[PDB]
Design a protein that fits this description.
part of a larger assembly; 5 chains; A: mainly alpha; two-stranded antiparallel ribbon; two-stranded antiparallel sheet; 5 helices; 4 strands; elongated; C: 3-stranded mixed beta sheet; about 25% helix; globular; binds potassium ion; binds magnesium ion; RNA-binding
RNA sequence: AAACCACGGUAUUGCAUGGCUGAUAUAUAAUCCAUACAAAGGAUAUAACCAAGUAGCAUGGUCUUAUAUUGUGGGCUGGCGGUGUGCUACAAGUAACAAAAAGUACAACCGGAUUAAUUACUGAAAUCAUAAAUAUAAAGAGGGAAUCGCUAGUAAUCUUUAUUAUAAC
């Protein structure tokens, strides 16, 4: 029957194969947001434009639900580690979790980043 | 930079235009009133205290007697130069019209074109 | 709360439910509701974040609380509040 | 000197003394005295009968005072209780209306209505 | 009448300046310009994850090869 | 969603394991901060008994089409008691307000908790988020047995920055 293999990475910089969880669904949301980004911005401007009458702005408000899915909302998107998919402990400037980042730094696989003391 | 083949650096597009007021007055024969009005329109540079980033497209420096214009509206280096040159001509046209002065070959050349406006 | 100049918020799904209800019972909607007759039926909804409007008067709402639809009949004193303030989710 | 049946201390400034009225505070008391032509340098013992009458008339026309203010607040709370909203139940139970108060909710417990 | 350049209203100077270089956007306006003045980040969000193709033409799938060795290294199931 | 297929699992055993970490901490240093117009003090590194800890990740055994993958609302914040780590205060006016009438108010008008009405801001959505302002103006007058930190630019006290849609004590 059908199969859906877990997303895993085999890289020479790490002695073990690295597995991840739940990156496909978050990618689907990011694509949908880009799909409806233009229309969302137009309706945001109209609903916060005081020169328009309230009866017209109320009708525009209903377009946020009838003309686009709820999963295109930018507030429902989270940043996961690109290698493991973990949400908590993420280091944004590198895109990796603190667990993976620390080990890679020790072996010089992150450009310019080294231990500090002062 | 290492990522040149994957993304265009955002700082390639901006351009700046500088002109010395004393030379500009001599070339176009601007009167004293016209020069004074031009300086007032420009004014000193304004930098936001939150980031210390210049936010004034046009400003005047008294120590160097220089009028500067910054153009970064578009993504192309050349398109910003075309924008900056047009804006400089607009300022000259406004100041000259209010306070007409001497006539010079440069002023006659621009007048025939119409200041490209 | 929501800025007053931006108007009240009401869900599109809730409005469609009321519109269907009015079509089913035109006589009560036009006349009966004002005399004081009770609604012939109830409307179940999940819209706990919608505001109660003056136009919702004499209607019976079954508001979901996680397990069942708790009945809520709209009174004049309830206008301006959310439907979720009259349907309790926790029990002691 | 008594305004709204509240005794004002004689040695205190007028704008400071008026804060003792239920329904007037610092900012509002200062407005009342200045509206009547009294600055911050005038003390209660320096007032005359005409000055007191002007203050009393001004307050009654512009502000809601002790007894009417207390009634208005209570009626607001009672309406919530009868509506049976989330806040109304909390008022009836005698506990705070905040989300997480299982660790520190003592003040609302001793100030029940 | 002759108006000296030093006695021109600031309002007229501002209109000339903004008519040429544009009108800035204030912190809290209700004209609907703040939404349209923000940059779009549709592409930046959708190119965040490291998702190389499962099968690269001309190369072996090391993850697929890794799985096969694991199955052979232990006893079969059922 | 993958075809001489590499199904999935936040299911279980940390007493079957890898990796990583808590746990003795003096002394020393071709290391770092600072230094160039006279100086002081720190940081980092230095092999563990403890079957100590481990649904991030990887792994042997056992279990499971599905103990998988998904939609809407609800819960993790829950009317009660105990208590750890912090912030804000009060005895002690060396306080409080402040743009000095070389001052102003008061004599804990010191303290700023709780609740009512109102408005702004972010967001598709704000009763159960935040801020401001008006009214309201609570406990607290230095705290039992007991107990913690530190020995000089240190304790104490004050301001600011960063991680960082809105949201730090
Ligand atoms: K704290
Ligand atoms: K104590
Ligand atoms: K210190
Ligand atoms: Mg008072
Ligand atoms: Mg599960
Ligand atoms: Mg162990
Ligand atoms: Mg053990
Ligand atoms: Mg331990
Ligand atoms: Mg355990
Ligand atoms: Mg859900
Ligand atoms: Mg928790
Ligand atoms: Mg004191
Ligand atoms: Mg005070
Ligand atoms: Mg004292
Ligand atoms: Mg007391």
């Amino acid at each position: 029957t059908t199969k859906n293999f877990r997303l895993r990475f085999r890289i020479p910089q790490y002695p073990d194969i690295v597995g991840s969880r739940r990156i496909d669904k978050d990618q689907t949301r990011r694509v949908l947001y880009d799909q409806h980004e233009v229309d969302r911005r137009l309706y945001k401007a109209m609903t916060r434009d005081e020169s328009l009458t309230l009866p017209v702005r109320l009708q525009v408000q209903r377009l946020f639900e009838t003309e686009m899915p709820r999963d295109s909302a930018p507030s429902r998107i989270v940043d996961r580690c690109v290698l493991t998919g973990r949400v908590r402990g993420l280091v944004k400037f590198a895109g990796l979790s603190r667990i993976m980042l620390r080990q890679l730094i020790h072996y010089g696989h992150i450009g310019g980043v080294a231990k500090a003391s002062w | 930079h290492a990522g040149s083949a994957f993304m265009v650096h955002p700082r390639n597009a901006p351009v700046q235009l500088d002109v010395r007021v004393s030379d500009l007055k001599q070339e176009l024969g601007l009167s004293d009133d016209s020069a004074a009005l031009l300086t007032r329109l420009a004014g000193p540079e304004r930098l936001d205290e939150k980031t210390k980033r210049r936010v004034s497209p046009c400003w005047y420096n008294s120590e160097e007697d220089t009028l500067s214009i910054a153009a970064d509206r578009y993504n192309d280096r050349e398109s910003n130069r075309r924008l900056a040159l047009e804006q400089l001509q607009a300022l000259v046209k406004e100041c000259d019209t209010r306070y007409p002065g001497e006539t010079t070959p440069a002023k006659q050349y621009l007048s025939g074109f119409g200041f490209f406006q | 709360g929501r800025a007053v100049w931006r108007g009240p918020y009401v869900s599109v799904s809730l409005l469609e439910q009321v519109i269907t209800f009015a079509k089913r019972n035109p006589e009560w909607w036009n006349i009966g509701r004002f005399q004081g007759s009770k609604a012939p039926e109830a409307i179940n909804t999940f819209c706990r974040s919608s505001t109660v409007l003056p136009d919702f008067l004499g209607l019976k709402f079954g508001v979901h609380n996680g397990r069942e639809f708790v009945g809520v009949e709209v009174q004049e004193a309830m206008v301006g509040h959310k439907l979720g303030e009259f349907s309790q989710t926790t029990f002691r | 000197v008594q305004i709204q049946r509240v005794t004002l201390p004689p040695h205190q400034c007028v704008y400071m003394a008026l804060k003792k009225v239920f329904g007037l505070g610092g900012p509002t008391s200062l407005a009342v005295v200045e509206a009547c032509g009294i600055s911050k340098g005038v003390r209660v013992r320096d007032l005359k009968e005409n000055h007191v009458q002007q203050i009393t008339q001004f307050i009654q026309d512009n502000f809601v005072t002790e007894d009417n203010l207390r009634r208005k607040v209570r009626e607001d709370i009672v309406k919530l209780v009868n509506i049976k909203s989330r806040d109304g139940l909390r008022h009836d139970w005698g506990v705070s209306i905040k989300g997480h108060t299982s660790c520190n909710g003592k003040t609302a417990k001793r100030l029940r209505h | 009448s002759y108006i000296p350049p030093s006695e021109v209203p600031e309002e007229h100077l501002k209109n000339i300046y903004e008519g040429i270089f544009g009108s800035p956007v204030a912190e809290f306006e209700r004209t609907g310009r703040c939404a349209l003045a923000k940059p779009l980040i549709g592409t930046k969000l959708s190119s965040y994850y490291f998702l190389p193709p499962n099968r690269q033409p001309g190369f072996h799938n090391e993850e697929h090869e890794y799985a096969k060795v694991r199955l052979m290294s232990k006893r079969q199931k059922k």
